[PDB]
Write a protein that binds this ligand. Structure first.
Ligand code: HDD
Ligand code: HDD
Ligand SMILES: [Ca+2]
Ligand SMILES: [Ca+2]
Ligand SMILES: [Ca+2]
Ligand SMILES: [Ca+2]
Ligand SMILES: [Ca+2]
Lengths: 675, 673
């Protein structure tokens, strides 16, 4: 509603100033036709002042990201576990807006950097805006919010030269990770495929912190939020991610945009783990510690409702850039915990909007407005867009008949702090000793990945640590990695020419947990939206016919098909010059195009070797690949015909049926070497 | 540093607040060891408030860039042509700060996007700060500053979804270009290798506009600024730039930073073309039109002095992010012209600093301060750092004895407007008809490029225009291109499966001009700083030995050598896993590593792909040690190719290879239409 009221249509009409005076804006007013521009040209100055002031500070973290509208629908009346109004009835719908992001990069940095990712969700509830400001990884680097600028200074570019962009592959970051062992768990997640998701739709969301569900009788339970993807879990490989950062920095935002435009809006089951207050230390670690997960073997997930994103913004700046999330946007039926990471966040997100917005009335921007009436005695401030009719904005008053009325647990559906909560003890700047195991869970996570996934994680660390210049930092990194796993430390040390420290088995173990592996999570549950590149030629009308035949068969099943040839024409979407294997989830060469794949093939229309390099890159990166028409191509690529995920069929139908199974498998991991 | 007065050392001492109270900053204050955080924790709040407020708006354009300090030295007393103090004596030195940039991308976008580039120079003169806010292309897309938001909206990402980053390769940009034909000249420059320079040190800087030099006696002449690189002109190739944008988004800033750190700070001759006022229309176009160059054949360059950058910043945000350039930072001896693009800039750069700084005292930031006293009656404002002793800040006054005194042509070395300038006519919002030829100069430029360079430009256009979804926009683009060159139109049209319109010869010609070609600009004058990747192996102790010997011989000549192998050790800089051909200007394989040409330590095929990419992209490549055929045959690289080297002798190999680094690119490796 606040959005619809502020939509501005410029599909017709004459140009006006911001005060509705019709004007022009194409030629400056000058003293003669070859003369100096005049100060009295208000048309020039208003247009250029606006331009000059377009930009606002980027977000201090998560500067790079993209958003969409949708709806949350409750599966049930959840009154038995929370008073939350948005959860109080089967089928109850609440509008949402979600923004997804990286963490370290500035605006304009690439989507496919290796990083932690944001997953921030606003529920415009009938009892106020409720935000769950989460990440795609369920644990955080640090245990106390006061350390956030340390973490973030260390990962962001070195501040003398501002190098490197959007990367932890520098001395300072690994200096911090090695000195602050709490970082191990999130580190291991970021060095897995969770640091390079295939799309925002193929990752989960996590609140990280323990929160409370509070009932209308005052009782509480402890919860963790999990948003579980209905699209499946999928990652890129690092070598692919690096090329994609160059070829399409906008890959995740375009994937989102496109999925929504085609009627394939992504979905998640909004879930919780729910445990009793008495179980704060029962699972072998402290539920106040944001570097720990509750293994699902100890507390299963309950599905609360469906999150669907199905509408793109109208103006990115107004909606996506200006959305201002806060964990302080809480509603009756939810409460905080004493997680010292959460506790400090509550301060930060209120304060930082003053930086972004430049003034205190940021909740008035349409994307930040609620969908219920606002009744309070907040007044004035720069940018004040309301005209308040209550001329006695103080409590207690008689002159406004004691309105607005105080809301609390007893009346008015007020927020209230869970009334069972207490504090006791000295006023301290001390870390709880219950937070001191920094290594067991990183090992739990590592144990739960498949062998090739473990290899990819090792290889990520090998990559990044080999770029650390400091020999001491690199030694200190091995010291910490060795506390998680001696084998990781040895394997990583081998790439950097150092020896690993001797095994220290204090935290070693062989326990695993379900639901953290990407490679182990089975085939994708849908292939709709996945991209197939068909490599063809204009030389041979046979090639274009085969391509068209595959197109119809793949499109029917919701795949996005790109036919690539030397030059554009009817049925060809993309020239070889602009094509890359990073643009596809699977690649098919029509056998009529075989000539383009020869070592001597050359054209002024694309770079030498491009058609073959698309095919070979796709294969090396694990993708389903094949040749359709029943040979030259598989041999030019040194691609084995018997390999899993390599397809070779004369029959278009048999080809598509086999090829679509391989898109669901998504990645053929047998093509990656192990230690 | 020139900013040493403002430096803060933290190499010793105990943590303090901003008001000097010693504190801690690692644990929050809590009501109990597992308790909630306390509002009274001022340590937490001051630290997190600062964090929360670290960011400032990026620049509205040229958001992505990097800078360095240096010195300008005059070659002579230029009293003959300008009263400018910084140019008034042979050997006179003035500190400078320079920022280079792209145009369209935000912060964090890649250095090697295809774009126009900024080259902004501040001279901290003894008569005030003087800025030349230029680009690496000598002409601008548009003819009136009022149009700047239109250009920039069209080239920046589409505003519904903010896609694409740092790119003209989208419908809106090509829509604007094809509807505003003024854009042709800059567009051809940007679609040339001038859109993807090899480094900031391998590009020139241009003021674009005609300015005036003004002597103390009031007379004036018309000038164009040219800063001509002493490193040579060089570009990337587009495939290479695309990969490099992913592998190293910081490539230009690192190149610069490393050059300075190694004592190879980049140099430019600061030059002008100098013509009489009576020549404003004499060259076949109007000197007020920023879409035109004065061909060097009509007005030669005069060298004024030397620009050398030789000191990197101490704090990037404080120095580079905060530097606030303005064309209104002008000094006695220089004046403006009635170029309608320049005229409107003067407003923009003073105003925009209010957005960036959040208040009016942005000239007090250390990087913005002048190196001479300030005497004026500007007062107050947020962030005011000065404590003014004059309590009568108005003119005219008696109560401060009439100080500060007015400065003008005749007293106090004042700035003064060139007194021969006049204006005549109606007050109009009309374009001079003298601006109307949008197409001849683009053709002049295109004609001046070599054949392969012409092909690269065609190829950049084919790449971008093929991404334009609108058939109508594509057709309109072909219409404009065809007015520059029919052949360009035909060759671009072929890629996008449309027919070019028939020849329209109104603006066609065969004239050329010197100094605009990159490919034609001959070997580089220096190879110092250029990057040689030596691909080796740890399996064979002789391969490491070969690499060490090559390293020695190459480093002697000031090349930056990287030895690559499977794993790090003594003498090996980089693993195959982190290496890429975009990291090198030439690639050498030692023949002890020939067996590499699969492993858990690097992606399949990586060693050979580095060599093959390097060859495909034009670089000098070769095999040192005598046995070349196994590597060269694996690569499909012909032993007899130009810029392909095979020698057993390390000296012979390096002597040959260095000639190839100076040639820089072997253009025979690219197909022509
Ligand atoms: C004490 C400070 C602090 C700490 C410990 C954290 N953050 Fe935060 N976060 C910020 C301070 C902050 C911020 C500076 O206040 C940002 C920048 C922009 C904004 O609105 O808030 C932010 C932004 C931000 C966003 C982007 C929201 C958007 O798309 O606009 C996400 C997703 C997160 N954070 C998620 C997390 C998670 C899951 C954390 C740990 C569980 C976390 N942050 C800890
Ligand atoms: C009407 C406005 C307008 C017009 C016509 C131009 N510019 Fe500009 N330019 C700006 C308005 C602007 C600005 C909005 O004022 C910026 C953003 C940051 C700043 O300080 O000024 C800017 C920044 C900016 C910078 C970055 C300086 C730095 O590194 O901080 C360079 C190099 C240029 N411009 C160069 C040019 C050149 C060579 C132009 C034409 C000859 C040009 N601009 C026309
Ligand atoms: Ca660093
Ligand atoms: Ca993976
Ligand atoms: Ca567009
Ligand atoms: Ca402000
Ligand atoms: Ca004057």
């Amino acid at each position: 509603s606040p959005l619809a009221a502020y939509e501005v249509d410029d599909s017709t009409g004459y140009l006006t100033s911001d005060v509705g005076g019709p004007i022009q804006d194409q030629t400056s007013l000058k003293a003669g036709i070859r003369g100096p521009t005049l100060l009295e040209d208000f048309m020039f100055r208003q247009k250029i002042q606006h331009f000059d002031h377009e930009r606002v500070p980027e977000r201090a973290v998560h500067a790079r990201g993209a958003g969409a509208h949708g709806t949350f629908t409750s599966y049930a009346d959840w009154s038995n576990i929370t008073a939350a109004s948005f959860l109080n009835a089967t089928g109850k719908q609440t509008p949402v807006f979600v923004r997804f992001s990286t963490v370290a990069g500035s605006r304009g940095s690439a989507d496919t950097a290796r990083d932690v990712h944001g997953f921030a969700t606003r529920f415009y509830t009938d009892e106020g805006n409720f935000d769950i400001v989460g990440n795609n990884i369920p644990v955080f680097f640090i245990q106390d919010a006061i350390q956030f600028p340390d973490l973030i200074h260390s990962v962001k570019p070195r501040p003398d030269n501002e190098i490197p962009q959007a990367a932890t592959a520098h001395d300072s970051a690994w200096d911090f990770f090695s000195q602050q062992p709490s970082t191990m768990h999130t580190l291991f997640w970021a060095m897995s495929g969770h640091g390079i998701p295939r799309s925002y739709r193929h990752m989960d969301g996590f609140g990280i912190h323990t929160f409370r569900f509070v009932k209308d009788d005052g009782s509480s339970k402890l919860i963790k939020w999990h948003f579980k993807s209905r699209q499946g879990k999928a990652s890129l490989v690092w070598e692919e991610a690096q090329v994609l950062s160059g070829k399409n920095a906008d890959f995740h935002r375009q994937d989102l945009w496109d999925a929504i435009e085609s009627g394939n809006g992504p979905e998640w089951d909004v879930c919780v783990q729910i445990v009793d207050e008495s179980q704060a230390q029962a699972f072998g670690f402290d539920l106040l510690d944001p570097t720990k997960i509750i293994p699902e073997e100890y507390a299963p997930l309950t599905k609360l409702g469906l999150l669907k994103l199905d509408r793109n913004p109208t103006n990115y700046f107004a909606e996506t850039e200006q959305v201002m999330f806060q964990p302080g946007h809480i509603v009756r039926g939810i409460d905080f915990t004493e997680d010292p990471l959460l506790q400090g966040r509550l301060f930060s997100y209120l304060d930082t909007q003053l930086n972004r917005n430049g003034g205190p009335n940021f909740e008035q921007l349409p994307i930040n407005m609620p969908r219920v009436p606002i009744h309070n005695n907040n007044r004035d401030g720069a940018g004040q867009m309301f005209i308040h009719r209550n001329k006695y904005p103080y409590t207690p008053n008689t002159l406004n008949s004691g309105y607005p009325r105080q809301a609390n647990q007893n009346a008015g559906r007020g927020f209230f702090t869970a009334p069972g909560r207490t504090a006791s003890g000295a006023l301290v700047r001390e870390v709880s000793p219950t937070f001191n195991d920094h290594w067991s869970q990183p090992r739990l996570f590592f144990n739960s990945l498949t062998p090739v996934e473990q290899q990819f994680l090792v290889n990520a660390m090998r990559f990044e640590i080999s770029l650390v210049k400091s020999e001491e930092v690199k030694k200190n990194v091995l010291t910490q990695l060795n506390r998680v796993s001696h084998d990781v430390a040895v394997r990583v040390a081998a790439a950097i020419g150092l020896g690993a420290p001797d095994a220290d088995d204090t935290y070693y173990h062989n326990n695993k947990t379900a639901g953290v592996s990407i490679v182990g999570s089975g085939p994708l549950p849908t292939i709709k939206t996945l991209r197939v590149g068909i490599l063809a030629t204009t030389s041979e009308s046979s090639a274009l016919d085969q391509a068209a035949q595959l197109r119809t068969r793949l499109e029917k099943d919701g795949l996005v098909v790109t036919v690539v040839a030397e030059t554009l024409r009817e049925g060809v979407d993309q020239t070889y010059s602009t094509a890359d294997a990073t643009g596809f989830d699977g690649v098919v060469v029509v056998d009529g195009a075989a000539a383009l794949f020869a070592s001597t093939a050359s054209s002024p229309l694309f770079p030498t070797g491009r058609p073959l390099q698309i095919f070979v890159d796709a294969y090396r990166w694990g993708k389903p690949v094949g040749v359709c028409g029943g040979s030259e191509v598989l041999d030019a690529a040194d691609v084995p015909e018997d390999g899993d995920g390599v397809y070779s069929e004369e029959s278009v139908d048999m080809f598509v049926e086999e090829f679509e199974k391989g898109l669901a498998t998504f990645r053929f991991t047998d093509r990656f070497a192990l230690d």
